Design a protein around this ligand. Structure first.
Ligand code: 3PH
Ligand code: LDA
Ligand code: LDA
Ligand code: LDA
Ligand code: LDA
Ligand code: LDA
Ligand code: LDA
Lengths: 51, 223, 86, 220, 223, 86
């Protein structure tokens, strides 16, 4: 992503496992947001992720 | 103070302190162990309860002080001011975790969960679970759930220690009574003779030093 | 009250069988050592006590595991009855 | 602050609160049971009453919390319109039914009905044929009838639990006395030999957890 | 009168006074010794505890007075007014040295040092090691360490004394039984005869004078 | 008044009745075993205890019921005498 990522302590209680690729971080981020129920934003400096 | 409600909360906590100390701190253990020692030695009046409790309180102070200090240094920072209810609430919550850790280290989770499910009215209060699934339950558990579990978990521990401490003296009693029967002095009560033997035995072991050290070492570690 | 009747009767039956075994052993040893003094016509106070002590200690080394099984079983059972209504 | 006579009523209630807890809540029962445990183990001063009561008070909150929450949201959060004596009286009374139902669940009918008739004081000395032990109800007894019947029921329940708790420890020490009389050692008291046995028996049973769990389970 | 905070400190001290006397003073030793003597003579109600503790409190007052007087005179002195926190705090500290130096003679070095090690801020690795020179370490360990070590060592030394006090009466109790058996009166309880012998022995020995003198001599120096 | 005297008398009377049977059997067993030990010379002393424990427990089993009926009837009676005045 080339950006620092901030994750809420409510979201950080969810878990994941598996083998992943990061060919296109933005698209992967969107798919996982809708599969896990996250919401995210970007202010130009850091990415923020919440439940 | 900068906030009247902060002031109110601080004074309330200061008013409840002695019941928290008596119900959520190692004082629960140390208080009991010394009284069991006195009973096993067979002494009625001496030392005084307030002597024993005074020592117990001093020792517990060392163990608990690091947490109090951490929380004070955390809370006295005015470095951030709060946009909203949730931001404040989370800031406060994250401060208790130094205490919450200590309770969760020593209580036993099956009670904690049982109480959690009980204060919620959920599924009529108790129901079966087909599946067993653990959900980082360490961070979920409310302090109002943790406190009783800690209390019971530590009372039991005290009884265990007292059990072990009784055995050596029981040996002395039965031995004295048997050698008096060997002499045929059947009328004479052992307690006239067995007591001093117990006294010198404890003095030679230096039981107070070993006992006090070991109690602390269960919680801290020191060179 | 079939529950109170049961718990009360079992308490006494347990006292009777828990205590019986040591006293039986002590009595049989007592009789044999009392006899031997008669056929030998030789007498002292201490020999029976000395042997009785050993006999009872062996009795406890052997049976004590079962004493624990019996007491735990009864301990659980009475609690469940007390809190049975809910 | 709304109506100030409602303010006076709130401060009054807040002052009486500890006696209501002490006489109309399962704290009554938990407090007694834990002290009897200490007596049955034969300990005179440890754990402190400060500790035992602290535990009992905590546990009872779990049981009562569902009711206070409902009463709060019913009275304070909901704005409502009411205009006369009868409408207000009915509104207030209806809020208490959540607690009333708990008392009637744990109270004994013939005694509650006796106190009701005693406070009407009507035609008094009414006979047992004025009653026929009916079973299913839509009666709504007074709370001043329900409180003491509750207290007097809880106490009896506690005594009953205390009956069973003593038995195993009574066995444990008569065995010790009999073994000491099988030996010659009748000069020596059992107590100093008997106490540690009771302490191990109790920890092996983990009695504190079984007690707390089972006490809670009755009210679920 | 004076600094409002100095006033608060004085009143707090005077509120905690009886727990200090009960936990960090020779009263601890004398209280135990007298009760043990009563048990050695075998009396269950004579003298009253209310008499024994009264005597013990008076005897302790002599030993403790000179320190309280010296510390009082040290603070009732207009000599200076203070520029800074470090000057004031070191002036305060230099006033307690008389008490600190009383506690140091009787607490035990190894236990004291263990408690001082216990107070230091925790570290994630085991704490960084140190050795410190005598003017802190020998001369000036902290009072929150000294105090419990004192209490424990005092209790121990008290039990030790009680042990020696029991021995002659044990001798009596045995001899008298053996003589009754030599006379064949096997069924009579020997307590009925041993008790008065014990009393005779104690009055002819004048045990109260000896105990009261020697206990004071352990702390005072009299010529 | 006479109710007081009557109730107090009855208390002693019930003590006597309930305690009487166990103490009788413990006496008879004590005499028989003591005689037997003179008829054949054996100097044991726990044998009486061993037998009389079984003897007393057996009759506690037998009388367990009548004991509770008597005490209930007495309790009801004295509660009536205390409260039913008019
Ligand atoms: C055992 C003795 C322990 C007694 C606990 C004292 C509690 C002090 C209360 C507190 O923490 O706030 C102080 C509070 C802290 O305020 P701060 O300076 O803003 O941190 O006030 C003070 O500055 C210290 C005043 C303490 C005076 C107590 C002296 C006690 C003397 C004991 C006998 C000698
Ligand atoms: C082990 C000695 C003490 C046991 C006490 C048992 C009390 C039982 C009380 C009920 C007796 C009357 N019964 C059997 C009709 O219920
Ligand atoms: C003379 C000692 C009397 C002890 C009475 C209790 C005996 C049963 C419980 C202790 C059993 C000890 N054991 C055999 C496990 O080592
Ligand atoms: C010297 C007499 C000591 C009697 C008490 C001994 C401790 C209780 C027995 C513990 C072991 C019980 N057991 C055998 C079931 O494991
Ligand atoms: C008078 C006999 C006492 C025997 C011990 C009674 C049970 C408590 C102690 C042993 C418990 C059994 N356990 C867990 C060690 O296996
Ligand atoms: C050493 C035993 C002393 C027992 C004294 C009490 C006797 C009554 C016991 C309750 C009635 C009989 N039973 C069998 C139900 O226990
Ligand atoms: C020590 C007196 C004799 C033991 C019996 C004491 C009364 C226990 C209660 C009796 C209850 C009778 N029952 C079961 C019919 O209700």
């Amino acid at each position: 992503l080339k950006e620092p990522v901030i994750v809420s302590k409510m979201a950080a209680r969810k878990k994941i496992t598996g083998n992943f690729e990061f060919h296109d971080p933005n698209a992967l981020l969107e798919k996982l947001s809708l599969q896990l129920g996250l919401i995210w934003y970007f202010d130009g400096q850091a990415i923020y992720i919440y439940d | 103070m900068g906030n009247d409600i902060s002031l109110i909360a601080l004074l309330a906590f200061s008013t409840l302190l002695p019941f928290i100390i008596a119900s959520g701190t190692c004082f629960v253990k140390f208080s009991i162990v010394f009284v069991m020692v006195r009973n096993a030695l067979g002494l009625q009046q001496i030392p005084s309860n307030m002597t024993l409790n005074g020592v117990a309180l001093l020792l517990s102070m060392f163990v608990m002080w690091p947490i109090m200090h951490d929380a004070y240094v955390y809370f006295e920072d005015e470095d951030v001011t709060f946009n909203d209810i949730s931001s404040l609430s989370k800031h406060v919550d994250e401060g208790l975790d130094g205490y919450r850790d200590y309770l969760i280290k020593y209580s036993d989770r099956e009670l904690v969960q049982f109480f959690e499910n009980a204060q919620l009215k959920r599924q009529y209060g108790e129901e079966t679970e087909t599946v067993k699934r653990d959900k980082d339950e360490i961070e979920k558990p409310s302090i109002f759930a943790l406190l009783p579990a800690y209390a019971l978990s530590e009372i039991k521990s005290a009884f265990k220690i007292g059990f072990y401490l009784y055995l050596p003296f029981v040996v002395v009693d039965l031995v004295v009574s048997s050698v008096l029967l060997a002499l045929g002095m059947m009328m004479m009560s052992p307690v006239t003779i067995s007591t001093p033997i117990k006294l010198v035995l404890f003095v030679a072991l230096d039981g107070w030093t070993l006992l006090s050290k070991g109690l602390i070492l269960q919680y801290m570690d020191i060179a | 009250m079939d529950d109170l009747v049961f718990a009360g009767n079992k308490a006494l039956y347990l006292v009777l069988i828990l205590s019986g075994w040591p006293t039986i052993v002590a009595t049989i040893i007592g009789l044999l050592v009392g006899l031997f003094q008669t056929v030998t016509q030789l007498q002292e106070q201490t020999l029976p006590f000395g042997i009785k002590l050993l006999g009872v200690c062996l009795c406890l080394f052997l049976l004590s595991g079962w004493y624990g099984e019996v007491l735990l079983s009864y301990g659980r059972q009475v609690i469940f009855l007390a809190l049975a209504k809910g």
